[PDB]
């Protein structure tokens, strides 16, 4: 009855949110799916939290899919007890990771000229940056 949340670690590269959802659905319903992803590029941190509809089925998947030799990786599927589960442990689950291209956004910033006053503010800021080192040396 109580939702059964599965910590799946050591995830082979490619076994991502969509792929986990199809595979884990065969065992039982997956209310929502959350995989840890990198700060900037959103690359998998190789562990996901899969809460099933019930603890019972999640226990079955944890037993069946523990130490699974997948793509040369031993899969770790543990039922995490609810006591360590927190409110935002499944935050943004089943929500696409829109990787914001920070680097190109600043490149667009670089391409975007400052307002003439704000550009002069930069030039003075560079002049501040020039005189800040002035007493620094």
């Amino acid at each position: 009855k109580k939702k059964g949340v599965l910590y799946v670690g050591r995830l082979p590269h490619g076994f991502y949110e969509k792929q986990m959802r199809m595979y884990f659905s065969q065992f039982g319903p997956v209310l929502r799916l959350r995989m840890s992803r990198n700060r900037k590029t959103g690359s998998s941190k190789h562990y996901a939290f899969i809460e099933f509809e019930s603890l019972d089925v999640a226990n079955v998947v944890a037993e069946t899919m523990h130490n699974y030799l997948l793509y040369g990786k031993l899969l770790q599927c543990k039922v995490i007890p609810e006591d360590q589960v927190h409110e935002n442990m499944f935050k943004g689950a089943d929500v696409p990771f829109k990787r914001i291209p920070h680097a190109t956004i600043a490149r667009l910033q670089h391409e975007k000229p400052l307002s003439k006053e704000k550009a002069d503010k930069l030039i003075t800021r560079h002049n501040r940056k020039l005189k800040l080192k002035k007493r620094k040396l």
């Binding site: 000229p113 550009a119 030039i123 020039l130 040396l137």
Partner: peptide, 14 residues
């Protein structure tokens, strides 16, 4: 240590 700074970059970026 600054080897060289642009003396006429004001209008180049303008």
């Amino acid at each position: 240590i600054p080897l060289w700074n642009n003396p006429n970059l004001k209008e180049l970026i303008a």
